[PDB]
Amino acid sequence: ERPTLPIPDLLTTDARNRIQLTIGAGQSTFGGKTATTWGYNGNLLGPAVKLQRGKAVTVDIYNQLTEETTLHWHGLEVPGEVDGGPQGIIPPGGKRSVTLNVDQPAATCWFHPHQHGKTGRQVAMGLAGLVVIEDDEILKLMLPKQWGIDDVPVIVQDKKFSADGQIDYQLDVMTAAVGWFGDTLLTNGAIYPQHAAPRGWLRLRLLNGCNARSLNFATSDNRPLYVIASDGGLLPEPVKVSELPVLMGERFEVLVEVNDNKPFDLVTLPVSQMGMAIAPFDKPHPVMRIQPIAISASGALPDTLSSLPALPSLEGLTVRKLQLSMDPMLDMMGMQMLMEKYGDQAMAGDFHHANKINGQAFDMNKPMFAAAKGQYERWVISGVGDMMLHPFHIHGTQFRILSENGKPPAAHRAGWKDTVKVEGNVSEVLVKFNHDAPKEHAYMAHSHLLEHEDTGMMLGFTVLQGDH
Ligand SMILES: [Cu+]
Ligand SMILES: [Cu+]
Ligand SMILES: [Cu+]
Ligand SMILES: [Cu+]
Ligand SMILES: [Cu+]
Ligand SMILES: [Cu+]
Ligand SMILES: [Cu+]
Ligand SMILES: [Cu+]
Ligand SMILES: [Cu+]
């Protein structure tokens, strides 16, 4: 009796070379209770916008909410002016158009709001969509590619609800400290759905769309997952894993084997992050049921996928230090609240500017620095002196991780990424920005634990000129 997995529509340009996105409020049902929800072209979540490398598209965005919002293309390398950070306000009842000139490798990216101080609430209410970038190279690989049959997006999110059935979002001292988390897991908006998949190989495009919760994917019968792509695109070869940790905002594409008369579940395993192994997440928790079917499939697991360029020489590059911090009093009170409500299981395994980078809370009208254009830079990001998890994301770039929180990156994490783990230690990434970003439409760099972002842990930076 499980509902079928909802499939976002795959949306391409029309004869005018446009795509229309409407942002609005509607209603959804969760376990027989109605909730007010927000969506793109719909009442919850959104479509998957399909783009080709080297082709321009124009996106018309209609805000039919009664409050301001913005639309950011997470993972897509575009100029500040169309990046849709906090300065890209779309008035309630208004329309903004952006032209996107796609110039990066095939990848699964996504889109969501970036309204200043309110991003967590707007994502919790339901706003998220997907971007599918294709190029010439990926289409020659004979990967599974029937959308909604053997090539399927999997957007995983937690929410909590009040007794009246509404989504229960509060930015308070506990949530500003540890993040907004809940007791109900959704998969493309549904609770424990089933997906009917052809015998052979199934391609899952995994997105952790949670506000604050880290995930760790595995299968019910321990069959392996073959990682084929990260945030910014294909890896050089598939990497076989028994489990796959995924931070907030991260994407991975995996292939899994589907065999006759053997259903299995995709699950998430308990994580060690504060607050996130509370019941029902103290044990392995189901995400979706895979049901084998006997319709045609042509997809395969290739020996080779692509080629990564060599990491450049590190001598001579500009180094930028980014020190993350949390107000000791916020940490104090939030942790105490968490302990009092839930006890030891919560540790298993004015705060509106309390969270900072280099001693400064986000200033929308003062960028912290100007980065070079077209030149490699080394950015060193530290959570030393703090216990919380900071998945650190940088707009405008796909980067390479040199060191991740005390160690070289795992093989499946060594390709193109837009997020890096920072948690009580220091990480180092190699970045290059191909496009301009002025003071009036600056690039953001921030923790993707959304409650931290909303209470100050973000900076603006410009990109202007390069070598002179
Ligand atoms: Cu994002
Ligand atoms: Cu982003
Ligand atoms: Cu602002
Ligand atoms: Cu206090
Ligand atoms: Cu204290
Ligand atoms: Cu604690
Ligand atoms: Cu903290
Ligand atoms: Cu550009
Ligand atoms: Cu962002």
Swiss-Prot record:
Use case: Triggering CueO activity at need by the addition of copper salts with minor toxic effects on E.coli cells could be used as a simple tool for biosynthetic purposes. The protein was also identified as robust host protein for use in biosensing and drug-screening applications.
Activity profile over pH: Optimum pH is 6.5 with 2,6-DMP as substrate. The pH dependence of the reaction as monitored by oxygen consumption shows a broad activity peak between pH 5 and 6 and a second activity peak at pH 8.
Any one cellular-component term (Gene Ontology): periplasmic space
Regulation: Ferroxidase and phenoloxidase activities are enhanced considerably in the presence of excess copper ions. A labile regulatory copper ion near the T1 copper site is important for the copper associated activation of enzyme activity. Ag(+) acts as a potent inhibitor of oxidase activity by binding at Cu(+) binding sites, blocking Cu(+) substrate binding and oxidation. pPD oxidase activity is strongly inhibited by sodium azide, an inhibitor of the electron transfer.
Chemical reaction(s) catalysed: 4 Cu(+) + O2 + 4 H(+) = 4 Cu(2+) + 2 H2O
Lineage: Bacteria, Pseudomonadati, Pseudomonadota, Gammaproteobacteria, Enterobacterales
Organism: Escherichia coli (strain K12)
Gene Ontology biological-process entries: detoxification of copper ion; response to copper ion
Family: Belongs to the multicopper oxidase family.
Reported phenotype of the disruption mutant: Disruption mutant is slightly more copper sensitive on complex medium than wild-type strain under aerobic conditions. Deletion of the gene does not affect copper sensitivity under anaerobic growth conditions. Deletion of the gene leads to elevated biosynthesis of enterobactin under conditions of iron scarcity when copper is present.
Location within or outside the cell: Periplasm
Keyword Metal-binding: yes
Result when mutating residue 331 to A: Strong decrease in oxidase activity with 2,6-DMP as substrate. Loss of the copper tolerance phenotype
Record comment regarding domains: Contains a methionine-rich region, which includes a helix that covers the entrance to the type 1 (T1) copper site and blocks access to the T1 site in the absence of excess copper. This methionine-rich insert is involved in the binding and oxidation of Cu(+). It also binds additional copper ions, which are important for the copper-associated regulation of activity. The methionine-rich region provides at least three additional Cu(+) binding sites: Cu5 (sCu), Cu6 and Cu7, which play related but distinct roles in CueO oxidase activities.
Pfam families in the record: Cu-oxidase (PF00394), Cu-oxidase_2 (PF07731), Cu-oxidase_3 (PF07732)
Residues involved in Cu cation 2 binding: 74, 112, 448
Record-listed E.C. numbers: 1.16.3.4
Binding site for Cu cation 4: 390, 447, 452
Free-text comment on the cofactor: Binds 4 Cu cations per monomer. Contains a mononuclear type 1 (T1) or 'blue' copper site, and a trinuclear copper center consisting of one type 2 (T2) or 'normal' copper site, and two type 3 (T3) or 'binuclear' copper sites.
InterPro entries cross-referenced by the UniProt entry: Cu-oxidase-like_N, Cu-oxidase_2nd, Cu-oxidase_C, Cu-oxidase_fam, Cu_oxidase_Cu_BS, Cupredoxin, TAT_signal
Induction line: By CueR, in response to increasing copper concentrations.
Protein name: Multicopper oxidase CueO
Quaternary structure (record): Monomer.
Effect of residue 386 to A: Decrease in oxidase activity with 2,6-DMP as substrate
